[PDB]
Design a protein around this ligand. Structure first.
Ligand SMILES: CCCCCCCC/C=C\CCCCCCCC(=O)O[C@H](COC(=O)CCCCCCCCCCC)COP(=O)(O)OCCN
Ligand SMILES: CCCCCCCC/C=C\CCCCCCCC(=O)O[C@H](COC(=O)CCCCCCCCCCC)COP(=O)(O)OCCN
Ligand SMILES: CCCCCCCC/C=C\CCCCCCCC(=O)O[C@H](COC(=O)CCCCCCCCCCC)COP(=O)(O)OCCN
Ligand SMILES: CCCCCCCC/C=C\CCCCCCCC(=O)O[C@H](COC(=O)CCCCCCCCCCC)COP(=O)(O)OCCN
Ligand SMILES: CCCCCCCC/C=C\CCCCCCCC(=O)O[C@H](COC(=O)CCCCCCCCCCC)COP(=O)(O)OCCN
Ligand SMILES: CCCCCCCC/C=C\CCCCCCCC(=O)O[C@H](COC(=O)CCCCCCCCCCC)COP(=O)(O)OCCN
Ligand code: HEM
Ligand code: HEM
Ligand code: HEM
Ligand code: HEM
Ligand SMILES: CCCCCCCCCCS[C@@H]1O[C@H](CO)[C@@H](O[C@H]2O[C@H](CO)[C@@H](O)[C@H](O)[C@H]2O)[C@H](O)[C@H]1O
Ligand SMILES: CCCCCCCCCCS[C@@H]1O[C@H](CO)[C@@H](O[C@H]2O[C@H](CO)[C@@H](O)[C@H](O)[C@H]2O)[C@H](O)[C@H]1O
Ligand SMILES: COC1=C(OC)C(=O)C(CC=C(C)C)=C(C)C1=O
Ligand SMILES: COC1=C(OC)C(=O)C(CC=C(C)C)=C(C)C1=O
Ligand SMILES: [Ca+2]
Ligand SMILES: [Ca+2]
Ligand SMILES: [Fe+3]
Ligand SMILES: [Fe+3]
Lengths: 750, 750
């Protein structure tokens, strides 16, 4: 250790305290998870279904793409409805039509507002009070509810079949015809849908708050944000602004003038080390990064196609094979794979450069095995998803081989274990290069310690996804899944990137190593403080209680703090272009890392915070504001990191290859301005129109085909094409650029 | 001009565009102001009251302290209810009791939720649809409403009298017994109360939105934030975070390295110029600053006393003479006077130092006349308010001599003209010192131009308060009043301060003058951009339409941007302590200006933004979050500025007088930590408990005696005493310190 004990003990302290909050409120997530009533029975006494049928329905839902086909509890895809909200609304409306007929022999819609208000009050009384027995033993539905449920089951049985009545709906929902062709599976699935709506609509014992924290916004049962949601929402903003103001104050006042900026080396240091065999073995990883990235981008276009034409594509019904659910899955899964691969490549490039520019024994071996391991996992998983969504996949294999139905962990459990083994194997290849450099009785090993930590965090924190299986409770799946998607990606990828950059720039002699170790420990602490408990900003409405929402709100506020100030970091890293004339070769990677800062600030920070205070998210969860954020944050940050890192590794593994300034201006500006156009001209306007709808009418309405198929939204969804094309141009330029680079040095190992 | 053309044209552009938005949406504020129906009649045809009675009631309300005694449309004092919300709730509940009796011969409270829901639906139908005729000609009340109104009039007739039934309420409301002793005036006043509740509860023609933008939160008539409110609220946060992120990005990338830091002079430059006669004439202004400040602080304690014991003070009923309404008025009015005087003194100290350390002819004259002019205005206004609140003041003199009843412009119109004439006269004394320095055919006159602009902005933008008279529509009063309180204080005082500091530090040779002119033009643009349209964040619910709320929300978001980054500015100004050994003499003033930055960030920025997005404010307007902000922002920023400036002028006009490091550590830390304790241990917890109540039940409930008199709130109101005392200690230390200073070397503290 040495001059960074404080920054270390602060990181450890942040980790300790944060994983306390995450792990403790993890016990409260498990405990307060909406019961799955062993038995759902009508009051008349007839057994409707039970746990096993709700869970069987979870698996059927999984098998069809789960969260890749609309949403549950506001998690998943956005073209189909939130099934919970849609179900809730359809069941409550069915109930109200039965209520209204019983009491007035007119339908609810036919009644005067006062009759309607009284019905709504009886609906609310019934639905909100409809807890299962103690031990979540038996849920009795009133016969009206049992009936509402029966006729809501009927509706979804038709929607998820080939039933021509609901063809327009499937088109509008980018559902393939016969999404879920087994009638039993569809029935079971409706049980699952029921259960989520039920949870959504049932107050927790001795609360005014549903198991989903009154999610979704369903005025009919007085699902409105809790007052606590509203509390923590205001607190989050204060936490955020306090946090920024104090961070800037701390930084302004606790820098200490800063010193030690030696002249940059004469020669790029990283060009002094000869490419190890395992470093030249990364061309194919760079290929895979751009291949998957280009694939991914096309899959977004394919996905985006279905949001404007749910089924045909020049009159061939592509949805039979490549439905929205599949291409959305692939779109997301491919994003992860190519981003991960960028990072994995970045790391593997560094590993042998960390043990003094020499390969650990069998590092080229491992770098080639790891590569095919990843391609296997990608092809297998993708095939698995195809087969899951095609409904070829035996239901009882679906979760292993098919589609977990959980967004970002969609790949079958087998492939997920493959991916984990891959990433663990990469942990070994990294540590093969980093352990010697740690065990060498030498100088400042603190950046490298932070890196090996980062590397082990990547290495192992993807195994958080094995704490849920197929029939695990959504709330528990949700808990663990957001370890992966939020903690492992948005946290441990960040720190590994930031640490690997700090390490590269320090190694390049652009930054002292003190300045790097210090910068990257302080960053670690900054990101992890908000990051780690910020996992909960995904679990507000996932069957979780208000504490989870408090932690999530407040700590997600803290997570924005370091993002919003990234203007300064960005400039610090961009400054490095001028430190040495050879930094012109790292121009583009450096432009990426500035785009990372930019999008971290805007995408992750601004658009993450837009949707983060429970009260905002309460309404906008599962609206187009998420994909705004998701695009801006995942691509803008980790995509540009991965590409930046791609271009960096390319700079070194094709050291004579000069990037085309034109191609890279197109690649870089196409991506940046494509991404801004997608967000600002399509996704964000839509998310806001939907936010309006969600707030005005309810979540069901914001997600509803009638609403989603209105002309403004059709035009805004069509207008996405501009940004999508500007972006595909950029992505194409980037893909070509890297391909040309790779083809400029042995075209037959890529 | 010269190297600052861009920064100038940007300031002019910001001013142009901003005063466009303010002046344009000012036409929309006038046009969309809730009608005052010429006639209010029962449907049965009986004339209840009219315009003249509502306006007469406005004057009666004014006469009793207006906004210094609870709130109208969430503007005013917080110990009494919001009368609009309280009235609305009492009338709607009365209506519901009449409804419930008509239909069920039980009271609303006695009915089942469904009956209650149906009644609420009929209430909502009636109240929301209850527009006046076209031309705001006649408002017909349903006889039930006419009755609800009659029995709500009765309640307030009793509350505002000596009626022993409502004694506990008056105590809880810090209302004096016989607050409004004329029965007619009270009746008229209830008409006014009615009208505000009516506006609050009536949808605008062809909207779902009341004249007050559904304010207050009154679930009974589906007064909930508009979807637009909710829209602009999310946009504001995005505008804010985008704004910070981009500002930091712009700053990070568009600084240009920065150069020209000459060695600080050897001798304090300002000690080289001999004190002009008009500068020594400022001791008494410094006295008045601390006298009013100490008075003000005691008045806060007196005010705070009434929030825990509405009437007695060791068993003598002080409320007969010095009721909460009076001492709150004085508390606020004194704040303005001593803060203004700080600035006016600061300016007058600079005036002769700007025309080369020599007094314009008759500057000592003017500085003495201006002083007694201010003391006259302070004593007269204060006497006026006493007499208004005592109800001695003839009602028809009340608005001229008494109490305008509008917060921060409470002083009678005469005194307000006095204050304006004073500030205009100060404009002349400033320009007496600044015009020569501008007309001298010389070098860089751009800071001094920005200063003379700032000075003219102070000089004239207080005359915005003469665009409303006594019987002016609240919405129009509100429009103009917030020019004064928000624009003139929170905008033109800021820029004058910042410019006068830039000017002082530049004159001291601590900053280039380029760096000053540049810093202070960029600041001007930054503050004015958000500041000026941010006036509207006061008018969201004041009878204004959604555009006003959009502008207000978005531009108030922009106004936070420069505040949150002030950590950096603060450090830049604090840096100056080290530039010259003689800056030890300006240590404390510099500590003030850092406290200004701190509180600008936290008080104005964090706590201003806490309460700023229409959706937050919708619920928290008139809750203890405002006084948190108001204390932290007005004292923390302008109070410390004024005191900073006080200590600075003291440093020079008592140039041999050394400040007591102990006294000033107590003064400074007592104020800072007193202010933090007041906010964090009392006001903020309360505001949040009330926010909870406001969101859960409605504004009426959050402001209601039952709620406000709960034990937690009693304890939190009592616990204020800690911070109040720590603060009074600080203030006392500061007052003594300045007194001792003034009493040193020829004692001149008039
Ligand atoms: C590695 C990181 C440590 C965090 C582990 C948290 C897992 C939560 C387990 C959980 O929810 O238990 C139900 C009752 C469970 C509470 C578990 C508390 C974990 C504290 C973590 C301390 C980290 C330092 C299964
Ligand atoms: C060298 C590279 C090879 C490394 C291979 C690692 C594979 C381990 C994965 C196991 C997941 C088990 C899922 C069944 C469900 C019950 C809970 C099970 C929890 C197990 C996960 C533990 C974390 C991962 C280690
Ligand atoms: C109210 C207060 C707020 C103030 C608002 C001000 C708005 C203006 C914001 C920023 C402007 C400053 C940026 C200047 C950079 C110039 C550097 C330069 O010439 O270098 C070149 C490469 O640029 C680079 O350094 C590379 C940058 C590329 C990465 C960024 C991606 C952005 C794309 C987003 C499209 C919407
Ligand atoms: C807030 C909106 C409404 C405005 C309120 C305040 C109005 C009062 C007057 C303001 C500006 C007066 C400046 C006059 C002196 C400048 C001209 C002069 O003699 O100096 C020149 C050099 O130019 C210079 O020294 C540079 C000339 C810079 C001109 C700036 C004009 C001010 C615009 C308003 C900015 C707040 C010689
Ligand atoms: C040396 C000192 C010299 C300066 C002295 C200035 C003092 C006199 C001016 C005061 C104006 C008071 C007008 C109030 C009368 C009512 O309806 C309503 C609208 C009617 C419009 C009223 C016009 C107000 C003018 C405001 C001033 C411009 C900012
Ligand atoms: C200098 C920077 C300042 C900005 C903030 C940044 C640092 C601190 C961060 C903030 C998070 C801590 C505050 C969380 C407490 C929230 C607890 C909560 O939800 O309860 C609220 C708040 O009341 C309360 O109990 C009041 C909470 C007290 C808040 C002030 C804390 C100061 C000490 C009251 O709710 P109730 O009305 O009791 O609801 C139940 C109805 N009977
Ligand atoms: C032309 C480029 C792109 C297009 C047209 C596109 C389109 C889409 C579409 C249509 C969706 C689904 C919205 C829905 O659920 O109905 C989506 C989701 C997503 N896209 Fe993209 N995409 C593009 C690029 C990218 C890139 C480059 C990344 C990351 C590398 C990415 C990551 C994602 C993610 C993570 C989701 C899931 C978002 C969420 O659930 O909020 N996309 N995209
Ligand atoms: C680079 C950093 C980040 C990345 C890569 C990232 C990525 C994502 C992605 C892909 C999603 C969509 C997840 C889903 O479909 O269910 C998401 C959702 C979300 N993110 Fe981020 N994020 C980042 C930072 C942040 C920050 C800083 C915040 C808030 C402070 C935040 C808050 C959220 C919230 C609240 C959601 C949920 C939206 C919803 O449930 O519909 N994220 N994030
Ligand atoms: C010991 C010090 C202080 C105490 C105990 C105190 C107390 C109070 C109280 C009790 C209120 C009225 C809350 C209500 O409406 O019921 C109030 C309002 C106010 N105080 Fe103070 N005060 C203090 C210091 C100051 C100082 C130093 C300033 C400015 C120089 C100031 C400015 C104000 C303002 C502007 C209001 C009106 C606030 C609003 O309506 O939101 N106070 N104060
Ligand atoms: C130093 C700068 C500022 C000062 C001196 C200041 C002062 C005040 C004062 C004294 C109040 C209470 C007014 C009243 O009683 O009706 C107030 C209210 C308010 N301020 Fe500020 N303020 C400042 C900056 C800001 C900022 C930066 C924001 C938001 C971006 C803001 C937003 C508000 C809002 C929304 C209210 C209304 C609260 C309510 O109506 O109950 N202010 N300000
Ligand atoms: C500052 C951060 C900004 C983001 C966080 C703000 C989140 C917004 C809070 C939403 S309040 C929401 O508004 C709703 C309507 O606008 C209101 O709900 C009601 O209103 C309907 C009128 O259309 C009414 O018919 C329904 O009974 C009901 O849905 C209510 O304000 C709440 O749901
Ligand atoms: C960033 C800061 C955000 C500030 C804006 C705050 C957001 C306001 C949205 C709250 S919606 C509002 O909440 C109220 C309760 O919290 C709701 O109350 C209602 O339903 C509740 C039972 O479900 C209960 O309180 C009452 O029975 C009933 O009046 C209210 O209708 C709802 O719109
Ligand atoms: C409007 O929906 C869309 C398509 O189908 C109609 C596309 O094919 C395309 C074409 C471009 C790509 C990225 C495949 C885009 C952009 C798209 O979003
Ligand atoms: C001592 O008791 C109290 C008062 O009178 C009842 C106050 O004046 C005040 C104000 C504080 C001072 C300086 C006594 C508060 C808050 C209080 O609790
Ligand atoms: Ca999703
Ligand atoms: Ca007030
Ligand atoms: Fe997240
Ligand atoms: Fe304001």
């Amino acid at each position: 250790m040495g001059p960074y004990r404080r920054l270390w003990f602060t990181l450890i302290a942040v980790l300790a305290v944060t994983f306390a909050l995450l792990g403790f409120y993890g016990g409260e997530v498990y405990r307060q998870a909406p019961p799955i009533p062993e038995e759902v029975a009508s009051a008349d006494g007839t057994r409707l279904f039970g746990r096993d049928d709700i869970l069987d329905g979870q698996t059927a839902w999984q098998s069809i793409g789960g969260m890749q086909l609309g949403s549950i509890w506001g998690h998943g895809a956005y073209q189909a409805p939130d099934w919970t909200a849609d179900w809730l609304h359809r069941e409550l409306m069915a109930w109200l039509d039965l209520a209204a007929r019983d009491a007035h022999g007119r339908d609810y819609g036919q009644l005067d507002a006062p009759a309607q208000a009284a019905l709504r009050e009886q609906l609310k009384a019934e639905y909100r009070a409809n807890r299962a027995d103690a031990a979540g033993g038996k849920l009795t539905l009133s016969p009206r509810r049992a009936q509402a449920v029966a006729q809501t089951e009927a509706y979804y049985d038709q929607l998820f079949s080939d039933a021509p009545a609901l063809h327009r709906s499937r088109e509008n929902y980018a559902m393939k015809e016969n999404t879920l062709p087994d009638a039993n599976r569809r029935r079971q699935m409706t049980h699952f849908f029921f259960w989520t709506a039920w949870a959504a609509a049932t107050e927790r014992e001795g609360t005014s708050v549903t198991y989903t924290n009154n999610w979704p916004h369903e005025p009919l049962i007085g699902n409105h944000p809790s007052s606590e949601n509203v509390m923590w929402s205001i607190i989050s903003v204060v936490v955020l602004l306090a946090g920024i103001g104090l961070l800037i104050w701390a930084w302004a006042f606790l820098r200490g003038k800063e010193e030690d900026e030696p002249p940059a080396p004469a020669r790029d240091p990283l060009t002094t080390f000869a490419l190890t065999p395992s470093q030249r073995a990364l061309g194919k990883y760079l290929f895979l990064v751009v291949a998957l990235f280009g694939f991914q981008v096309l899959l977004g276009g394919f996905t985006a196609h279905y949001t404007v034409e749910g089924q045909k594509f020049y009159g061939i019904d592509l949805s039979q094979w490549f439905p929205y659910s599949l291409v959305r899955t692939w779109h997301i899964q491919s994003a992860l794979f190519w981003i991960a691969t960028g990072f994995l490549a970045a790391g593997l490039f560094l590993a042998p450069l960390i043990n003094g520019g020499r390969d650990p024994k069998y590092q080229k071996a491992g770098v080639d095995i790891l590569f095919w391991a990843l391609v296997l996992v990608v092809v297998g998983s993708f095939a698995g998803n195809y087969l899951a969504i095609a409904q070829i996949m035996p239901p009882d294999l679906n979760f292993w081989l098919g589609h977990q139905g959980y967004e970002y962990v969609d790949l079958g459990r087998l492939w997920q274990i493959g991916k984990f083994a891959g990433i663990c194997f990469w942990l070994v290849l990294m540590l093969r290069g980093i352990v010697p450099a740690l065990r060498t009785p030498g100088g400042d090993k603190n950046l490298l310690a932070l890196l090996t930590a980062s590397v082990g965090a990547i290495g192992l924190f993807y195994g958080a996804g094995f704490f849920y299986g197929e029939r695990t409770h959504l709330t528990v799946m949700e808990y663990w899944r957001w370890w992966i998607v939020h903690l492992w990606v948005e946290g441990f990828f960040e720190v590994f990137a930031t640490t690997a950059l700090a390490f590269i720039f320090s190694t390049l002699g652009l930054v002292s190593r003190r300045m790097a170790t210090t910068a990257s420990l302080a960053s670690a602490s900054l990101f992890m403080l908000g990051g780690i408990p910020g996992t909960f900003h995904h679990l507000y409405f996932a069957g979780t209680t208000t504490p989870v929402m408090a932690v999530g709100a407040s700590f997600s506020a803290l997570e924005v703090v370091p993002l919003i100030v990234l203007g300064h970091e960005a400039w610090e890293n961009w400054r490095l272009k001028t430190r040495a004339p050879w930094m012109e070769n790292l121009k583009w990677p450096l432009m990426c890392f500035v785009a990372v800062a930019f999008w971290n600030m805007l995408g992750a920070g601004v658009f993450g915070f837009m949707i983060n205070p429970p009260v905002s998210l309460y309404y906008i969860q599962g609206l187009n504001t998420t994909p705004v954020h998701a695009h801006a944050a995942l691509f803008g940050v980790y995509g540009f990191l991965a590409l930046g890192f791609t271009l960096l590794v390319l700079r070194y593994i094709r050291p004579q290859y000069a990037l085309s300034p034109g191609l890279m201006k197109l690649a870089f500006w196409g991506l940046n301005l494509g991404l801004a156009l997608m967000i600002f001209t399509s996704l964000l306007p839509i998310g806001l129109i939907q936010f309006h709808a969600s707030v005005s009418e309810g979540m069901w309405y914001a997600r509803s085909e009638a609403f989603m198929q209105q002309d403004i939204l059709k035009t805004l969804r069509w207008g996405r094409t501009f940004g999508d094309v500007v972006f595909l141009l950029g992505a194409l330029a980037m893909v070509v650029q890297v391909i040309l680079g790779l083809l400029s040095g042995k075209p037959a190992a890529a």
